[PDB]
Amino acid sequence: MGLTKADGGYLVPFQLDPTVIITSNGSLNDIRRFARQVVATGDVWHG
Amino acid sequence: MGLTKADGGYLVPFQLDPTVIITSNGSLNDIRRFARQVVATGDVWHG
Amino acid sequence: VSSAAVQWSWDAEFEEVSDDSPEFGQPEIPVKKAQGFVPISIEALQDEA
Amino acid sequence: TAETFALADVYAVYEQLAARHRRQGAWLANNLIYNKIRQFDTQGGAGLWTTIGNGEPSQLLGRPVGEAEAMDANWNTSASADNFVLLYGNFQNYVIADRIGMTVEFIPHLFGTNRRPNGSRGWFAYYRMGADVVNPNAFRLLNVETAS
Amino acid sequence: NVTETVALLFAEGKDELEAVTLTTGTGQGNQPTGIVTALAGTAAEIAPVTAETFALADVYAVYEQLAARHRRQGAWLANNLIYNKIRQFDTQGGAGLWTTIGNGEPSQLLGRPVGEAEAMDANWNTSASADNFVLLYGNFQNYVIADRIGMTVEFIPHLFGTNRRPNGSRGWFAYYRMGADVVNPNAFRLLNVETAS
Amino acid sequence: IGMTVEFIPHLFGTNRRPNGSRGWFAYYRMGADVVNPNAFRLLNVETAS
């Protein structure tokens, strides 16, 4: 009676970590920290 | 994104009932309720 | 989980016993789905009672 | 006896079962089979389930009695090969897993063929469950199979 | 929770073994003597009135052909099929009415207690055995069961391997001692329905 | 407009009847450009063959 499923292996509780691990690089960009932001209302912004 | 494992099916919690289900028929006997029982203190009993 | 009872035997003196480990199974039950639909027209829903 | 139903079969379904399950079990059949059982005793012998004028007895051989219309009850005007008519066993080995009850939703706008509003509405509903047998040795089922 | 589960399994195994061997034991080698085995071929064996048929008079014959010293201190033992067949004897509605359908199993037959044993023979039609012992009546104080030790379990802490070193396995040993036989064989009446080939 | 997520109640099937699925729609709008190109100095390393 070992750890084989048919030999008692069905009694071991299943252990899971619910939290997900993102496996994507992403990107670090800082233009929005220096650039100038304005609010638009239509389709085009004129100056 | 459905119930298949690769489409989010890894997030469903596992459900299990630990209690054991005996699947052996067994047998019911009442000879012991009518017979005569004596204590033995050896390998044989005489009379 | 399901299983069975171990198998005994009437053994003699100085006689080796035999392995009696039981077998284990996992009864399983899926959950399925049913549905039904009733369409209706925009005239009927405001004309009928 | 083939193509025949008698008191012997009613006894046999009860007999051919282990004690551990037999001591706690129930009967499941259709009302036609129960009436057939009711019409076995004519001279008040050992088959006297009840007398005409009384409703359906709640016990048979000391065990609870239940009804289920979905099982077939006749093997003459039927054309199927097999007719399972009687059942007796421990029903605690039949698990009915229940997940979600009935829910009804109202779709405000239904669409036509070319993906434009059609001028209609609808009602959607769904229901989820699951059921199966855990131990298949805790039952007995009678099959009066019609020979061809 | 391995330990408690396996202890329950040991109990089930012990019962499933002993209850069977109390009824059908070889009596030679390493097995105790069963009741039907010790009542086979002795003057306890009788035959039905009509060959290959279990009728109402056969129960009465089994009850009758035993002496009054033991007949007043007897009990019935058979399979459930036999009790149901006795139940089905009555059709007209008189003097054969043990009980009616809708009632439990009666506790008395001819004024004596009733017991059951699943290890006895069931049907003489489907079975290929020439001998089918289906009914039993007698004084059961003449059947002695001698018991020595109850069911005990010991814990082996270290099993060894081929080269006599530990392999990382632990064990659970159990044993049980009992013995039984008949004393007077003329206090029983076993009915045998021999089906000819 | 920032990030907005809308919850579609019912996705439909091939025969224009509900098939039993729901949806998640998101979108945002923005725009950018350079008003004066003399405020920067970009370096290009033209590594031809």
Side-chain angles (χ1 to χ4, degrees):
Chain A
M1 197 194 334
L3 277 178
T4 306
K5 284 323 202 323
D7 286 3
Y10 290 114
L11 282 69
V12 288
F14 194 83
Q15 180 184 356
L16 182 86
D17 212 328
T19 178
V20 296
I21 311 193
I22 297 169
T23 74
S24 61
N25 309 330
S27 296
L28 181 141
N29 197 325
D30 293 8
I31 318 184
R32 256 194 178 278
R33 191 153 74 64
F34 303 128
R36 166 194 174 184
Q37 280 85 308
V38 297
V39 290
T41 52
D43 291 331
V44 287
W45 181 89
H46 306 261
Chain B
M1 191 185 247
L3 279 178
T4 58
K5 270 304 170 301
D7 301 340
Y10 281 119
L11 281 80
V12 287
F14 197 79
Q15 183 178 0
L16 183 142
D17 262 8
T19 178
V20 176
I21 307 182
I22 294 93
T23 49
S24 61
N25 306 329
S27 88
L28 183 63
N29 198 327
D30 292 358
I31 292 169
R32 189 89 86 162
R33 190 165 71 103
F34 297 129
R36 167 195 172 185
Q37 297 146 39
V38 296
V39 181
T41 66
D43 63 358
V44 294
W45 177 90
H46 297 277
Chain C
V1 294
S2 64
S3 67
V6 299
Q7 173 94 350
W8 290 49
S9 61
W10 293 96
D11 298 341
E13 191 166 350
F14 293 149
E15 204 265 309
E16 176 195 350
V17 298
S18 63
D19 180 18
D20 306 323
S21 57
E23 287 286 272
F24 274 116
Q26 198 169 20
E28 201 173 6
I29 289 150
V31 164
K32 308 215 179 52
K33 180 202 64 176
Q35 46 202 7
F37 192 36
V38 173
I40 197 168
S41 64
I42 62 170
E43 298 90 4
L45 188 153
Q46 47 191 330
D47 285 330
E48 277 144 30
Chain D
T1 298
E3 288 64 36
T4 317
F5 189 60
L7 196 62
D9 303 330
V10 176
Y11 274 107
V13 174
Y14 179 83
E15 312 152 344
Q16 316 188 19
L17 185 61
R20 167 191 300 174
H21 300 291
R22 169 166 38 86
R23 313 270 269 201
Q24 58 184 357
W27 299 83
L28 185 64
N30 186 10
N31 189 179
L32 303 188
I33 299 309
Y34 283 168
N35 297 357
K36 288 251 174 296
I37 296 172
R38 294 207 49 197
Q39 314 181 18
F40 274 105
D41 189 358
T42 305
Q43 311 188 17
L48 202 44
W49 203 12
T50 179
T51 68
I52 193 166
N54 290 343
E56 203 59 278
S58 173
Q59 258 183 345
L60 178 62
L61 299 185
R63 310 310 295 129
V65 178
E67 191 216 330
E69 297 170 271
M71 293 182 286
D72 60 357
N74 57 8
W75 53 98
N76 295 340
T77 179
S78 175
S80 175
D82 292 12
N83 315 111
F84 313 110
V85 288
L86 193 69
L87 182 64
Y88 172 73
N90 188 318
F91 271 87
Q92 301 257 321
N93 286 339
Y94 181 77
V95 176
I96 308 181
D98 186 76
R99 173 51 180 174
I100 295 170
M102 187 175 86
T103 66
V104 183
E105 281 156 30
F106 177 66
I107 297 89
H109 275 302
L110 196 63
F111 282 119
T113 303
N114 289 346
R115 306 152 304 176
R116 300 193 193 93
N118 176 222
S120 44
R121 288 140 153 69
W123 284 283
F124 194 72
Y126 58 89
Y127 181 76
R128 294 188 72 194
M129 65 179 288
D132 199 3
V133 172
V134 173
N135 190 0
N137 203 8
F139 302 104
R140 281 301 186 276
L141 176 83
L142 175 62
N143 182 11
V144 182
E145 162 180 355
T146 59
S148 182
Chain E
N1 290 319
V2 178
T3 306
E4 298 86 3
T5 304
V6 180
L8 163 64
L9 300 187
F10 276 118
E12 308 315 280
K14 179 177 104 204
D15 299 352
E16 173 194 310
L17 168 69
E18 166 202 297
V20 174
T21 61
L22 280 182
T23 298
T24 309
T26 64
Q28 319 292 349
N30 300 345
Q31 320 186 29
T33 306
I35 175 67
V36 299
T37 310
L39 293 176
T42 312
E45 180 180 291
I46 63 171
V49 176
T50 174
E52 203 168 329
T53 305
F54 179 59
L56 176 58
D58 294 331
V59 172
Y60 264 119
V62 171
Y63 179 74
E64 287 161 348
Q65 306 194 9
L66 189 151
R69 200 166 38 88
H70 319 287
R71 192 200 316 117
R72 300 175 161 180
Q73 301 203 150
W76 297 89
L77 210 66
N79 199 30
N80 221 22
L81 292 174
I82 283 288
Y83 288 161
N84 289 120
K85 264 152 171 43
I86 296 171
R87 214 158 157 176
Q88 303 170 2
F89 284 162
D90 183 338
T91 303
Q92 301 294 321
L97 189 136
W98 198 9
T99 190
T100 59
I101 62 170
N103 278 332
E105 283 296 344
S107 159
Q108 293 179 356
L109 184 50
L110 293 193
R112 313 305 324 177
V114 171
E116 55 163 320
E118 288 183 351
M120 278 201 238
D121 291 23
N123 283 356
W124 49 95
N125 261 332
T126 178
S127 181
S129 179
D131 293 331
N132 303 276
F133 312 106
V134 300
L135 193 70
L136 184 64
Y137 178 86
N139 189 14
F140 271 83
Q141 281 261 329
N142 284 335
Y143 182 74
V144 183
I145 294 171
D147 47 357
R148 174 54 177 153
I149 300 297
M151 183 278 288
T152 72
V153 174
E154 303 182 9
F155 179 68
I156 304 292
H158 278 116
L159 302 175
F160 290 99
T162 297
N163 295 348
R164 302 139 295 171
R165 306 194 216 93
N167 53 0
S169 61
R170 282 161 184 173
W172 291 351
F173 196 44
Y175 59 92
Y176 178 62
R177 307 163 42 81
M178 183 198 98
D181 203 343
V182 298
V183 164
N184 187 0
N186 284 353
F188 303 96
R189 283 302 186 276
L190 181 69
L191 178 140
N192 182 13
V193 183
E194 191 146 50
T195 61
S197 180
Chain F
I1 284 184
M3 192 172 148
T4 68
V5 175
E6 299 223 331
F7 181 68
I8 297 169
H10 269 303
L11 295 174
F12 293 85
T14 294
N15 286 323
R16 304 310 179 186
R17 273 184 300 301
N19 67 344
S21 48
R22 304 210 214 281
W24 285 345
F25 193 57
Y27 62 87
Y28 64 94
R29 309 169 48 188
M30 65 179 288
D33 209 346
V34 174
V35 299
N36 189 3
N38 284 354
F40 308 95
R41 279 305 189 278
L42 195 156
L43 163 68
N44 183 14
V45 183
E46 174 190 65
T47 180
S49 67

